[PDB]
Amino acid sequence: VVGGTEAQRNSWPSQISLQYRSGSSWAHTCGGTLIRQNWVMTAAHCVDRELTFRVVVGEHNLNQNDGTEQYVGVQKIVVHPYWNTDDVAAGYDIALLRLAQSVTLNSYVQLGVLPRAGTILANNSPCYITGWGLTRTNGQLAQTLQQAYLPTVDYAICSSSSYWGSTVKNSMVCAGGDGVRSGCQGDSGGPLHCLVNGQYAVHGVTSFVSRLGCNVTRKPTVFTRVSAYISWINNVIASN
Ligand SMILES: *[C@@H](O)C(CC)(CC)C(=O)Nc1ccc(C)nc1
Numbered sequence: 001v002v003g004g005t006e007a008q009r010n011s012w013p014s015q016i017s018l019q020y021r022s023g024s025s026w027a028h029t030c031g032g033t034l035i036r037q038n039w040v041m042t043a044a045h046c047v048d049r050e051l052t053f054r055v056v057v058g059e060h061n062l063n064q065n066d067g068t069e070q071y072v073g074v075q076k077i078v079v080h081p082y083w084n085t086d087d088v089a090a091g092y093d094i095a096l097l098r099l100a101q102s103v104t105l106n107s108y109v110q111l112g113v114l115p116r117a118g119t120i121l122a123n124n125s126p127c128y129i130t131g132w133g134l135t136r137t138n139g140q141l142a143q144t145l146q147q148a149y150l151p152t153v154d155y156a157i158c159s160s161s162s163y164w165g166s167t168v169k170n171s172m173v174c175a176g177g178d179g180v181r182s183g184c185q186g187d188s189g190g191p192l193h194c195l196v197n198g199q200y201a202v203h204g205v206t207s208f209v210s211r212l213g214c215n216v217t218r219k220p221t222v223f224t225r226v227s228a229y230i231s232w233i234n235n236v237i238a239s240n
């Protein structure tokens with residue numbers, strides 16, 4: 001997250017760290033959202049590679065075990081069947097991970113609230129991106145979970161020629177684009193939390209930013225629109 005601040009510890013308790021094994025160590029690669037005790041929602045492109053993955057719930061500081069963390073393997077990866085890694089702009093950047101064990105819910109580990117099917121937010125709606133991603137374009141991962149305010153940019157504006165043009169589809173949510181605050185490498189797959197009737201719900205899965213950089217004016221961070229995939233999500237959980 002570029003232009004963010006350290007989140008209050010465990011204040012986004014559905015945020016997970018998706019990690020892969022490298023030799024004998026683990027490395028953070030993407031975010032995700034805990035949506036059942038044994039299911040995580042993330043981006044398809046995060047699980048493109050044939051790596052050994054684990055999920056960390058209750059995480060805050062990636063470089064120390066503070067006592068709130070639970071570490072669990074990934075048993076099954078269900079990528080959206082229309083996902084095409086050659087064409088992130090075509091969409092379907094979403095995947096569900098079935099965990100090897102059900103995590104224990106507590107103050108630090110909670111299920112994320114998803115929006116009702118088809119829900120669309122008004123332009124400039126209040127949302128926050130969270131993650132351990134780079135804190136500047138070509139910088140380094142955050143040690144501690146970051147948050148930044150990223151208000152939505154509605155589809156008509158986001159897909160206009162002065163923003164993303166036809167690169168963005170109505171199955172995506174745009175947010176930010178002020179040139180200051182954004183998602184960045186390592187935030188992919190994580191949540192966009194948007195405030196609706198007093199409650200935060202995960203309306204986005206972080207998918208892409210500009211090739212020019214993370215925080216680029218009128219190139220808002222682009223998310224998979226979770227509310228476009230509610231049926232798909234429930235179908236996967238019911239049949240896996
Ligand atoms: C996620 O960390 C992000 C960093 C540039 C977007 C914020 C990313 O990796 N997006 C991405 C990578 C690869 C493909 C095929 N699509 C999207």
Ligand code: NA
Pocket residue numbers: 059060061062063064065066069
């Ligand atoms: Na930790």
